[PDB]
Design a protein around this ligand. Sequence first.
Ligand SMILES: */C=C\C(=O)N1CCC(COCC(=O)N2CCN(c3nc(-c4cnc(N)nc4C(F)F)nc(N4CCOC[C@@H]4C)n3)CC2)CC1
Length: 853
Amino acid sequence: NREEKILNREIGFAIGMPVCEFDMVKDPEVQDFRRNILNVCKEAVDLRDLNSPHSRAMYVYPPNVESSPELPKHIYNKLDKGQIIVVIWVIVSPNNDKQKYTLKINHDCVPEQVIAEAIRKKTRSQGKYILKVCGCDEYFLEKYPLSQYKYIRSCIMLGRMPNLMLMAKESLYSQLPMDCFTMPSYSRKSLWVINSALRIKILCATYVNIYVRTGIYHGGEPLCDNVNTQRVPCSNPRWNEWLNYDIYIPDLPRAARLCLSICSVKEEHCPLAWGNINLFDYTDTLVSGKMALNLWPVPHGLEDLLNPIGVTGSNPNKETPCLELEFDWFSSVVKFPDMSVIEEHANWSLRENDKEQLKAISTRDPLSEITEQEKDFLWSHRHYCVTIPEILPKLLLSVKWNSRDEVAQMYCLVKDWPPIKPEQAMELLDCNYPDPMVRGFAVRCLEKYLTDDKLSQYLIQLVQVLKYEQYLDNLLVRFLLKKALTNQRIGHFFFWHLKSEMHNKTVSQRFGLLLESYCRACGMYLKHLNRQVEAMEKLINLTDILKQEKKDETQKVQMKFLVEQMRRPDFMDALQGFLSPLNPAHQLGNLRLEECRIMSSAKRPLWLNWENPDIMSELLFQNNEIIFKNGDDLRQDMLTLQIIRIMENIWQNQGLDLRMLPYGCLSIGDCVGLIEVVRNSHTIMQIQCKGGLKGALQFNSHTLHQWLKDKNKGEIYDAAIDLFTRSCAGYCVATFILGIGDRHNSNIMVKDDGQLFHIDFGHFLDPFVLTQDFLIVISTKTREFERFQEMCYKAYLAIRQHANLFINLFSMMLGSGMPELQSFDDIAYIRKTLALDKTEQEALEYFMKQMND
Ligand SMILES: */C=C\C(=O)N1CCC(COCC(=O)N2CCN(c3nc(-c4cnc(N)nc4C(F)F)nc(N4CCOC[C@@H]4C)n3)CC2)CC1
């Protein structure tokens, strides 16, 4: 059992905690999860080794492609009569002489056709090759049309010219390890005949330093009124009381939970410690007998005396308030009925104006409240609503989940409900819908209609909604794990989104078990991941030192210390030669210390610089730069940049070229993160200072246009201006809709070619002062500003048509501890700025008026 021991050491390093901690967990659900998830592991491995080397090579090097092969009109127009010019590179002699061959080929050609044409053009002086992107580990291994590869479409939009390298397939396959996933060593009754009322005994409490407030909930809604116990003095926290609720035992839905908290009185009621318990365990058994639940500290800004959206389970730290409980015990062990009994009990238990009304209801947004009249209206028309599937969320919200009969009937309706878009299926995965059948339906919709591109695009939200799962073992987690173990690009960010939260002890168990399974089945990539981990490790340590020991020293003294520590051999091995967690296709070779530096003030961010060891680094970027910041929460930045990329995608696929810049930003831990470095970019303040009339002068705004004209002389000029306008327009709309924090001359940046973008998104959801610089680069009363206002109006409209998607994305992110996103009241800001309750012309006038100010 030696290979097993080495693998366990490596998984422990990668996860942070040792694997033997899991073994000591005497929880049946934990060991059952650990064993049962290996089925998904094995499915994924078998799919990897399914087709000899190619299957593995595409697991490790998946195609980075757009979901649709179709080209937007403006993207196709940029082609030369529908064709693209491409440079294919070949390394010939052992001296690595690079020889280039330029081709003009149809944009929809397959990599095989490109290789054929390249060899034809080369010999004018079989299928044993593959195409690599020059300068990074990205391959074109699949028979997609060239233009559908994200890199190629990017080259077509940016006017750059694609530079690919031809590579013998055997050279790549020889670099693929013979992955051996080894099986771990830890693998080898009534049915609500109880026609009664649910009652629970609160026994006593320990580690208390008042009354107990309890309730029965289904997600966020309460199935009956809350029940306060007898106010007892905190000296003797002993109640031994029986609480009876207005709920019949068989009326409890599958996902019924008990939410309790301990409260104090001054008059002034204050929560002290909260807790939540699954009324049914993972085996469908209705809990009975005694139960000790260790409670959790209250989160900041808690409205009520109960935390029902909080995670379920006993606090791992057992030296906390421990509440003792007793659940009724009946004839035998009680279990939730089988779907067959459900169908039996369901089978046992219309005007055109009304149809148009149902359609209009379905059209509304998620946050739009539905009236009780509308709820009963949707319910009385629950069979017609199967013709308009998207209305399913709202319909679900109209169910009385405290009634066995209605729950069974909705179950039947779901067993045959038509599939809906993934965008709309995700909404059914947030905290509003805990019912396992609805969640299964949403996961099935994702599994059938979600390409890996879109899966990557929404991976952060999917990982988040994981936390809303009632049990370790569920369909959503199995789906994500299988996609992660069959596509390494997805598995990279899967692993990192999970690890970045391992510090959160409310999700440590779930995410730790998940990471254990993943790392066990992920293959050789584990080693690579481990390297990344260690690197971050070192960085954190270093930065920690800088923020305490050498906290109050001068820039040059801190710089001397950083160059000293950075030069320690244990440190240099750790931070040289590994993959960029921001993008694993990017190798990071040796550190260029002469180029690393501490970034102005802040939490003392590190600006690091690596050589790019790619054989042809020069044709992409010879130096990669990243900002490691050990100070502030980056989750707000991640969500903002994801939304910006989604908005740019909408505008492109709709026909308005507003080039945004959603640069990379990855949260890797508790307030530790990485940020991409956009080359050839400067803040507006840097522009005004470099252009400062001189030493002892003001810094007027009129100089930005001069700086751009100096950096873009000749025919370039107009181009640059255009770029600047469009990007600017885009970001304006973006920042107005999301309500981003205070902008200023150092929050905004421009590149040497005119592109403008924003950075550091502190707070969102709680008016863009177009400088004279912006308006004069665009030129007040000019055709340029007319086109500018038209762009902005069109972009506002375009983003208003997808309001549901952004509202759902935020709703799903609510689960995260993100401060700027604690309640639906913060999200409502988007419903406000996009004028959802108003009409289209009304919202257009609203935006025009907001933009006049
Ligand atoms: C005229 C003399 C004078 O007074 N000077 C002081 C002002 C100049 C420097 O002013 C600020 C500045 O240039 N930089 C600080 C900001 N920085 C930056 N930050 C970030 C970023 C994003 N998010 C978060 N959470 N933190 C941070 C970071 F500040 F730590 N990102 C970037 N990136 C974004 C991607 O593209 C590149 C860019 C570097 N940059 C830039 C430097 C000097 C003269």
